[PDB]
Structure 1
């Protein structure tokens, strides 16, 4: 797979933390892991912002693939840009 959004700096940091919480061995983390990863990665967005974006993401049909959250989703969520 090849895709990204966050700048090099973040991409490196965000990825670092994500992996630490991506022990699912599938490549994607879980809801709980996501939120924890956001705060663990020393991100700007608060705690509710993340939990909200997620619960609101699949709220329609974003995580309908299974319910998990791959690094890709996290990034697109951290930047919140098409």
Structure 2
């Protein structure tokens, strides 16, 4: 078992995932990055859909409620919340699908 640890593979995946959208390399992911990311994916989906996954992901991804997600934050939600839609969509989208 594990509280919030992260495996080698999983960790790496998350690292690159954050560094991907991180154009300035600050280690933070705001709502603009999440939306622009899922939106940039260019998939057969409506507007409320992408806006929902991004809105929910951010709301359930930000504990301090500042408007930015940190490495630990995202990774934590991934190791915490079970198989979710926003999670899979993130790892996939961020990975260019």
TM-score bracket relative to the smaller structure: 0.5 to 0.7
Contact 1:34-1:69 at 8 Å conserved across structures = no
Contact 2:29-2:70 at 8 Å conserved across structures = yes
Cα distance in 2 for residues equivalent to 1:2 and 1:13: 18
Contact 1:35-1:51 at 8 Å conserved across structures = yes
* TM-score, with structure 2 as normaliser: 0.46
Deviation at 1:26, TM superposition (A): 2.3
* TM-score, with structure 1 as normaliser: 0.52
Q: CA RMSD in A?
A: 6.2
| CA-to-aligned-CA distance 1:1-51 (integer Å, 9 cap, x gap) | 999732110111121121011224322112343477799999999999998
- C-alpha spacing 1:61/1:78, structure 2 compared with 1 (3 Å): closer
Unaligned runs of 5+ in 2: 82-96
Cα distance in 2 for residues equivalent to 1:11 and 1:72: 10
Name which one, 1 or 2, has greater alpha-carbon Rg. Answer: 2
Contact 1:14-1:41 at 8 Å conserved across structures = no
Contact 1:31-1:54 at 8 Å conserved across structures = yes
Unaligned runs of 5+ in 1: none
Deviation at 1:71, TM superposition (A): 1.0
Greater shift, 68-77 or 39-48, is seen at: 39-48
